[PDB]
Amino acid sequence: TSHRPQLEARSGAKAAAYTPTGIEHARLLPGHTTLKYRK
Amino acid sequence: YIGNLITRQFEGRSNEIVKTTTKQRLDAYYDLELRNSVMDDILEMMPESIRQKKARTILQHLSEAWRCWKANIPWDVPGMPAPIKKIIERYIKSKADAWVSAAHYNRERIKRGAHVEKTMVKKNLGRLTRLWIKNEQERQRQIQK
Amino acid sequence: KDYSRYQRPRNVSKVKSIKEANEWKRQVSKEIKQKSTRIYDPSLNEMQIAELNDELNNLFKEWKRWQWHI
Amino acid sequence: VAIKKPKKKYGTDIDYNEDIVYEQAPMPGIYDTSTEDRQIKKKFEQFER
Amino acid sequence: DEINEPPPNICEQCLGDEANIRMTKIPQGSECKICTLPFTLYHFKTSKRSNNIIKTLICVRCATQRNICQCCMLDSRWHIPIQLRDHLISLVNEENVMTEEAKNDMMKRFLSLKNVKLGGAQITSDPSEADNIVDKLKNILLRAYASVDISHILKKLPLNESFLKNPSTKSFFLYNIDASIPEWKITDTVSQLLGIKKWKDGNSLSLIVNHKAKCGGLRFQSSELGERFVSKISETLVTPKGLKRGVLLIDRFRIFIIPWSSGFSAASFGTNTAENIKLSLSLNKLIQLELG
RNA sequence: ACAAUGGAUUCUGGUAUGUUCUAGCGCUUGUACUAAGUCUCAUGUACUAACAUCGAUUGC
RNA sequence: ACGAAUCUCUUUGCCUUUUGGCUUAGAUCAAGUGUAGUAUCUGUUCUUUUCAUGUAACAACUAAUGACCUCAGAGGCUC
Numbered sequence: 045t046s047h048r049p050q051l052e053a054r055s056g057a058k059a060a061a062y063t064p065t066g067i068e069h070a071r072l073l074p075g076h077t078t079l080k081y082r083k
Numbered sequence: 084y085i086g087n088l089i090t091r092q093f094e095g096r097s098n099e100i101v102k103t104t105t106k107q108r109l110d111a112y113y114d115l116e117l118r119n120s121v122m123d124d125i126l127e128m129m130p131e132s133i134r135q136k137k138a139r140t141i142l143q144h145l146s147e148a149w150r151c152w153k154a155n156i157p158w159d160v161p162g163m164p165a166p167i168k169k170i171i172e173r174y175i176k177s178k179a180d181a182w183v184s185a186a187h188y189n190r191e192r193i194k195r196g197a198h199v200e201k202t203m204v205k206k207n208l209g210r211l212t213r214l215w216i217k218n219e220q221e222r223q224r225q226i227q228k
Numbered sequence: 229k230d231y232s233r234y235q236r237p238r239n240v241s242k243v244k245s246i247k248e249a250n251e252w253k254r255q256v257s258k259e260i261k262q263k264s265t266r267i268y269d270p271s272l273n274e275m276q277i278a279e280l281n282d283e284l285n286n287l288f289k290e291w292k293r294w295q296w297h298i
Numbered sequence: 299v300a301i302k303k304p305k306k307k308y309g310t311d312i313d314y315n316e317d318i319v320y321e322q323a324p325m326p327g328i329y330d331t332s333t334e335d336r337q338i339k340k341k342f343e344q345f346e347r
Numbered sequence: 348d349e350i351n352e353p354p355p356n357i358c359e360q361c362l363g364d365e366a367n368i369r370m371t372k373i374p375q376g377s378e379c380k381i382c383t384l385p386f387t388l389y390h391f392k393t394s395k396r397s398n399n400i401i402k403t404l405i406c407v408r409c410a411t412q413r414n415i416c417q418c419c420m421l422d423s424r425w426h427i428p429i430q431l432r433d434h435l436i437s438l439v440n441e442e443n444v445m446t447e448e449a450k451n452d453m454m455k456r457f458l459s460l461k462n463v464k465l466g467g468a469q470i471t472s473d474p475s476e477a478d479n480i481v482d483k484l485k486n487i488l489l490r491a492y493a494s495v496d497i498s499h500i501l502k503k504l505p506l507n508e509s510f511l512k513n514p515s516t517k518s519f520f521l522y523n524i525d526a527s528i529p530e531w532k533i534t535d536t537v538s539q540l541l542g543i544k545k546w547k548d549g550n551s552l553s554l555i556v557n558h559k560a561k562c563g564g565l566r567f568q569s570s571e572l573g574e575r576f577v578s579k580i581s582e583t584l585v586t587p588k589g590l591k592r593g594v595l596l597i598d599r600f601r602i603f604i605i606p607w608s609s610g611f612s613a614a615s616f617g618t619n620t621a622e623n624i625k626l627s628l629s630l631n632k633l634i635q636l637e638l639g
Numbered sequence: 640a641c642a643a644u645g646g647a648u649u650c651u652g653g654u655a656u657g658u659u660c661u662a663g664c665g666c667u668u669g670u671a672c673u674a675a676g677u678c679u680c681a682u683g684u685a686c687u688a689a690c691a692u693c694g695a696u697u698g699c
Numbered sequence: 700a701c702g703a704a705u706c707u708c709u710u711u712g713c714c715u716u717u718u719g720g721c722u723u724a725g726a727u728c729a730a731g732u733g734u735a736g737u738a739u740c741u742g743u744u745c746u747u748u749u750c751a752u753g754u755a756a757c758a759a760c761u762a763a764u765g766a767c768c769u770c771a772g773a774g775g776c777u778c
């Protein structure tokens with residue numbers, strides 16, 4: 045066995061109850077900090 | 084960098100590691116999305132009383148159809164329901180449009196010399212020889228007809 | 229405290245000390261436990277129990293020897 | 299001599315015998331299952347006796 | 348919700364008597380003692396000049412489910428421990444109420460995130476449902492080894508001598524001691540009788556009680572205290588052969604005494620637990636022979 | 640009548656991995672005889688390199 | 700050829716231990732010797748380290764155990 049299809053995907057219900065870590069990712073650094081509004 | 088290292092010491096690493104898609108696993112994530120779309124469309128055509136067992140067996144006709152496509156063997160299952168056969172042929176042609184177009188795109192990269200992986204050169208060779216014979220076998224049938 | 233290099237050891241006379249012998253004695257009881265567990269198995273092969281059975285007679289004889297010295 | 303437990307492979311590993319695990323209680327109902335619980339407790343203690 | 352959190356549950360007697368208290372909030376301080384999951388640690392001091400910081404040990408979810416304060420973990424009403432609270436409600440509803448706690452770290456965290464009350468926390472935090480059970484507490488107050496060779500030992504126990512003034516001894520032999528009646532209660536009753544209170548400073552008396560043999564002995568230093576122990580005991584029982592025995596008088600109990608006239612030591616009563624039980628069984632006849 | 644000068648190095652590499660290793664007590668029942676260690680060389684065997692091996696001419 | 704119940708049996712219904720991904724079918728279908736590394740065993744060389752007859756007279760030993768008594772375990776005595 046040991047090589048299986050998925051019967052269901054991993055839900056975000058499980059990651060929502062966890063405690064956060066607060067680790068600093070390079071793509072979550074501040075950029076494009078001002079929004080543009082249409083006329 | 085060191086702030087990520089020291090907080091990973093004091094707190095451990097997070098359990099919510101979501102892996103982004105990559106060149107390494109794009110063929111793996113394509114089939115997971117392709118199997119879910121086939122499993123959705125058949126489960127909605129079903130009248131009633133379909134479980135995790137019957138959804139498990141029908142996805143093996145999806146795999147068998149794509150091996151028959153690559154072999155240029157006609158996939159015809161005796162007793163297959165005509166709505167459900169229509170669904171699989173819709174998604175085998177959908178996967179074939181990605182498989183053939185990736186063979187055209189990567190061929191143009193190998194000619195330019197523009198950073199093709201050593202595995203992909205063996206993979207693009209193996210794709211075109213199926214496309215050449217599929218074009219060869221089709222040309223044989225147009226003379227015979 | 230180590231003593232792994234030292235035999236069981238079958239000879240007794242060489243170590244005069246008893247407190248050291250306190251450690252040597254466990255060095256034997258442990259094997260008694262391992263093999264003893266190794267005595268009952270689902271297969272229950274005669275050859276494996278049969279060798280273990282001889283080891284049990286050899287150990288019991290050693291217990292007789294330690295008792296005799298005392 | 300007591301039976302030894304299988305040692306924890308990780309930190310939050312679970313001993314299933316010690317605790318009823320992620321217990322979900324039956325939803326409260328209007329039918330007052332009070333004597334049924336007494337009889338089931340008496341039969342369970344009788345079984346373990 | 349991390350931006351909408353309840354105020355902490357603390358007792359009045361943890362906060363104390365003063366009016367304004369400067370309390371320090373740390374938004375993820377220590378982790379809870381019960382659910383092992385982090386919370387807002389509040390800590391404070393009763394007065395400004397105090398010397399003890401009073402921390403909140405548990406989170407507000409574990410404090411709500413048990414209805415206890417976070418600091419001393421006593422019940423918010425009645426101010427009693429949880430083990431005694433769930434026992435008092437057990438005598439009213441005639442069924443066992445109990446808050447049970449998981450030993451498992453995944454099942455300490457699971458049991459806290461549910462919004463139920465545990466144990467007597469349905470009865471408490473409802474004032475109507477708590478006062479009537481106190482009224483139901485009030486009606487309860489309206490009710491308000493034959494094979495052993497013991498013969499080596501009983502030669503050394505006195506058992507044949509009298510409790511008079513005239514012998515001047517240090518040691519005595521206390522028999523008829525129940526399996527209750529703790530060793531401190533017999534030294535306090537003797538020291539109350541002599542007024543030699545705080546006896547453990549000067550070591551005026553030393554007492555050995557077995558609690559299996561139902562027998563004991565108490566040794567005095569300075570033998571002139573022995574006549575004070577004899578003369579301060581008035582009530583005695585005379586066996587119908589003779590041989591009067593004084594009675595120490597622990598509440599509702601009676602403990603007989605005879606001057607040992609030597610030091611008994613430990614092990615006079617017995618040298619094995621199976622052996623000591625037969626000495627209580629030996630005595631039970633002599634008590635019945637002394638009285639009846 | 641020509642003065643034109645790019646590079647550069649680290650990391651991810653067959654035993655991996657897995658298990659057991661309670662000494663220090665939780666109350667009640669139940670005087671059976673003498674082989675050291677390290678270093679170097681040689682030979683033998685086993686495993687291993689996911690090592691390598693054919694480049695060219697003749698007197699019946 | 701219509702039994703109110705039990706068991707056994709036949710046929711429909713149920714399938715009730717009743718194939719759990721991917722890609723270049725994922726890839727291949729091959730003699731000995733030579734060299735390097737590790738481990739085991741044997742041989743040799745070098746160095747280091749472990750002790751000391753008979754008779755007569757005198758002294759010590761066969762400290763520990765048991766019992767009794769005083770003091771708050773020790774001291775004395777006897778066997």
Ligand SMILES: [Zn+2]
Binds near residue numbers: 382405408
């Ligand atoms: Zn908590």
Ligand SMILES: [Zn+2]
Binds near residue numbers: 357421
């Ligand atoms: Zn409190």
